[PDB]
Enzyme design. Structure first.
Site, PDB file in Angstrom:
ATOM      1  N   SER B 157       0.859  -1.168   0.000  1.00 16.44           N
ATOM      2  CA  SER B 157       0.000   0.000   0.000  1.00 16.44           C
ATOM      3  C   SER B 157       0.897   1.220   0.000  1.00 16.44           C
ATOM      4  O   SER B 157       2.088   1.123   0.289  1.00 16.44           O
ATOM      5  CB  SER B 157      -0.941  -0.001   1.213  1.00 16.44           C
ATOM      6  OG  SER B 157      -0.217  -0.140   2.426  1.00 16.44           O
ATOM      7  N   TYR B 163       4.978   1.592  -7.030  1.00 14.87           N
ATOM      8  CA  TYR B 163       3.940   0.765  -6.425  1.00 14.87           C
ATOM      9  C   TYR B 163       3.606  -0.426  -7.323  1.00 14.87           C
ATOM     10  O   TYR B 163       3.422  -1.547  -6.835  1.00 14.87           O
ATOM     11  CB  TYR B 163       2.673   1.580  -6.149  1.00 14.87           C
ATOM     12  CG  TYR B 163       1.549   0.731  -5.570  1.00 14.87           C
ATOM     13  CD1 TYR B 163       1.595   0.297  -4.252  1.00 14.87           C
ATOM     14  CD2 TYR B 163       0.472   0.331  -6.343  1.00 14.87           C
ATOM     15  CE1 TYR B 163       0.605  -0.499  -3.714  1.00 14.87           C
ATOM     16  CE2 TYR B 163      -0.533  -0.466  -5.805  1.00 14.87           C
ATOM     17  CZ  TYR B 163      -0.453  -0.877  -4.483  1.00 14.87           C
ATOM     18  OH  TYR B 163      -1.418  -1.671  -3.906  1.00 14.87           O
ATOM     19  N   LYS B 167       4.025  -4.378  -6.308  1.00 17.37           N
ATOM     20  CA  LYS B 167       2.864  -5.261  -6.291  1.00 17.37           C
ATOM     21  C   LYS B 167       3.149  -6.523  -7.090  1.00 17.37           C
ATOM     22  O   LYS B 167       2.889  -7.648  -6.630  1.00 17.37           O
ATOM     23  CB  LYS B 167       1.639  -4.523  -6.841  1.00 17.37           C
ATOM     24  CG  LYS B 167       0.381  -5.369  -7.041  1.00 17.37           C
ATOM     25  CD  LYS B 167      -0.765  -4.539  -7.617  1.00 17.37           C
ATOM     26  CE  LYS B 167      -1.264  -3.509  -6.622  1.00 17.37           C
ATOM     27  NZ  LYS B 167      -2.251  -2.581  -7.256  1.00 17.37           N
TER      28      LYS B 167
END
Ligand SMILES: [Cl-]
Lengths: 250, 251
Positions: B157, B163, B167
């Site tokens: 998060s 990001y 992920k």
């Protein structure tokens, strides 16, 4: 009232409030709905799970399964103390689906959740399309009732038993994606469960070497996932899929 | 076969589907536990009956200490605070010993990675990932040493291509773990959150315009998914992902 609006509609720590209870989010007390395919292993276990979590439930399956639905509904009504009823419907018959909508409202009161538990030459392509339209129209009346009664709900689609299942699976998944996008604003969520190999009885060794858990699933392991998606626990989950397959895909 | 795979467990009156969601008797830990997702997920697991260690950086020791008390008081289980810099393998080694000492075993872990000049971005991401991987690792080392199963949950998060990169790596890691550890009774799954609120009204509806539900999620909406994956309710679920994004991916 400038910042204390975001703070009212978006708590950071609900668990701080004594009235918050995480397990109550998985409860279906006050909720009403229906399960298709309910005479089969997946359906009746999902229905019993929802009833034990507190929902009223209509068991839906083919007219030829009336006596089984009636016995299952009496058994669940007695065991769990909710209104579990039997409603026969062949969902490939439009008129019967229109009648099911009426009887759901008249006998349940409303619909908050539906588990659309679908069963799977050029004959196959004809019967795939027939059964998909049956699934589609059953989900449609579910969310029409939700809208007509001015409240949200949860739609759960699955398909169970090679090209036929794959094509049916892809169609239902795209169908649920669009519903999730289009109905989110009416408070209605739509998701799918993709089960792997689940035990259903005799009427092996190879396909279990494929499965990292080296066993079949049971009906109760799908039923607990239906309860998650039907309950408020999954209140921000829409447009997605839960694979319940022992790792098969991995 | 007869007795190994029952068809209608609900017909036993001493069975309940709702016990599947209980965490009574279970012990485990949560990283990033001073942040929104971690503390909400810890509180969900504790409310459901688990003893829980709250793990985060040494600079959060006071926050963690107060959070552990807040949750011990509210829910009646043993909730403790254990600081650890998880990029230091020495500390992670001590974290493993302290977990076994103060909890007894580990049954679940919620590995909750935060995100977060070209060489440096890739180095920062890989150090962060490796901190997640090794706390995940001591979790299933403890399960296997003690002879029992468990459940691992991974998420990343914000704390965008950085990001996205994080992920993808975590998802691959969890797929590998799920395949490798199923024999040992250990499941591994990920949670992919969408926009979650953690503290301008038109800049609000700005990014909500592509969220079908047209609202942010809240920390508790991830916590309940964490609880589903940690409990026996998800006992046939491994090697996959649950997206919790209010419809963001289907707009
Ligand atoms: Cl159907």
């Amino acid at each position: 009232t400038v910042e204390q609006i975001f703070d009212e509609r978006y708590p950071l720590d609900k668990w701080k409030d004594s009235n918050y209870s995480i397990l109550d989010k998985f409860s279906m007390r006050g909720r009403k709905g229906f399960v298709t395919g309910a005479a089969g292993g997946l359906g009746r276990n999902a229905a019993a799970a929802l009833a034990q979590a507190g929902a009223d439930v209509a068991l839906v399956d083919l007219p030829s399964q009336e006596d089984k639905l009636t016995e299952l509904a009496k058994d669940m009504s007695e065991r769990f103390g909710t209104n579990v009823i039997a409603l026969t419907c062949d969902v490939t018959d439009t008129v019967q689906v229109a009648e099911l909508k009426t009887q759901l409202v008249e006998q349940l009161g409303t619909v908050d959740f539906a588990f659309l538990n679908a069963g799977v030459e050029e004959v196959w392509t004809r019967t795939i399309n027939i059964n998909l339209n049956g699934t589609y129209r059953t989900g449609r009346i579910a969310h029409e009732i939700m809208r007509e009664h001015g409240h949200g709900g949860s739609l759960i689609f699955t398909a169970s038993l090679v090209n036929a299942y794959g094509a049916t699976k892809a169609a239902i998944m795209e169908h649920s994606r669009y519903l999730a996008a289009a109905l989110a604003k009416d408070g209605i969520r739509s998701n799918t469960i993709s089960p792997g190999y689940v035990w259903s009885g005799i009427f092996h060794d190879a396909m279990l070497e494929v499965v990292p858990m080296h066993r079949f699933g049971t009906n109760d392991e799908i039923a607990s996932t239906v309860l998650f998606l039907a309950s408020d626990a999954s209140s921000y989950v829409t447009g997605t899929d839960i694979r319940v397959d022992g790792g098969y895909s991995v």
